[PDB]
């Protein structure tokens with residue numbers, strides 16, 4: 001079975017319509033297209049999310065506000081839209097397209113159309129039920145998981161974005177049918193502030209939330225050791241039936257965030273380990289603010305999913321000029337120190353290992 005690739009020219013243009021991260025969705029698809037990887041996948045046109053589908057997580061008051069300002073424009077209520085005053089009218093359609101695409105990919109998984117479904121323009125994990133947050137206006141990850149819960153009894157959410165996927169974790173904080181695992185930078189003052197190793201969920205969902213606080217400057221080898229160690233324990237204890245994987249590329253060297261020092265090869269190993277489970281897997285994007293590097297990463301990861309080694313030279317295409325001055329696919333880690341102490345890392349792993357002992361199905 002070939003991977004499902006959620007794409008349409010109308011979808012890509014809609015994903016860039018807010019211009020929060022200028023033409024990233026187009027650059028990502030164009031590079032994938034330039035390597036002709038789409039030829040090896042099953043292209044699926046995304047459906048648009050209805051009001052009811054989006055309301056499975058987001059409140060009516062929030063959604064109705066987005067639809068209203070799409071029609072009329074912006075003591076007003078706080079929905080986290082204070083940075084979009086010049087243009088709020090396109091947010092509702094953006095959210096509906098983002099939401100619909102991830103739901104579509106999830107439905108493909110349910111229908112048995114594939115084992116892997118890809119939506120690189122999704123993975124907006126910060127959005128709350130009643131407010132936007134961190135460039136996330138709608139949490140498609142939550143909508144995707146909720147859709148998969150119709151078919152699969154236990155869902156594992158893995159968030160490899162630089163930031164803590166607080167929106168997704170809070171959505172399922174009280175349930176034990178969905179386990180969230182997040183690897184992220186954790187430091188006083190760093191967005192979004194949550195996701196300490198001691199945060200393990202609430203009520204029936206206690207110990208069904210896993211957080212791995214990491215410090216600046218981590219590289220491929222250390223990251224994969226940490227990630228494999230956690231996933232190994234999580235898989236054995238929770239025994240997931242489906243996986244939703246968020247692959248925010250703002251961990252990659254060269255990103256304006258300038259925190260982690262990763263390359264796409266390191267992320268690719270984590271992905272390879274997850275794919276090894278051969279479970280129904282929903283692949284999502286997320287953060288990534290070095291445009292060319294994000295296209296580089298997600299194109300490489302697409303190659304990993306297809307089990308193909310791409311040529312090192314960036315092929316000529318629409319955005320070829322943006323890949324200078326090297327014009328290659330490989331990304332070189334920065335000359336920046338690793339702030340992660342080995343003893344602290346082992347403590348965290350042991351702490352999590354203790355937590356997962358409580359998890360028994």
Ligand SMILES: CC(C)[C@@H]1NC(=O)[C@]2(C)CSC(=N2)c2cccc(n2)CNC(=O)C[C@@H](/C=C/CCS)NC1=O
Nearest residue numbers: 083126133134135161162163190191248250286287288
């Ligand atoms: C400029 C930079 C800080 C940028 N910010 C913004 O572009 C705006 C829209 C302008 S000022 C601002 N937001 C802001 C002010 C106070 C507090 C926060 N943000 C907390 N939120 C974040 O830090 C999200 C964080 C993005 C997280 C992506 C997670 S995948 N954003 C930013 O890095």
Ligand SMILES: [K+]
Nearest residue numbers: 159161163183
């Ligand atoms: K994360």
Ligand SMILES: [K+]
Nearest residue numbers: 172178205208
């Ligand atoms: K949970």
Ligand SMILES: [Zn+2]
Nearest residue numbers: 161162163287
């Ligand atoms: Zn991020």
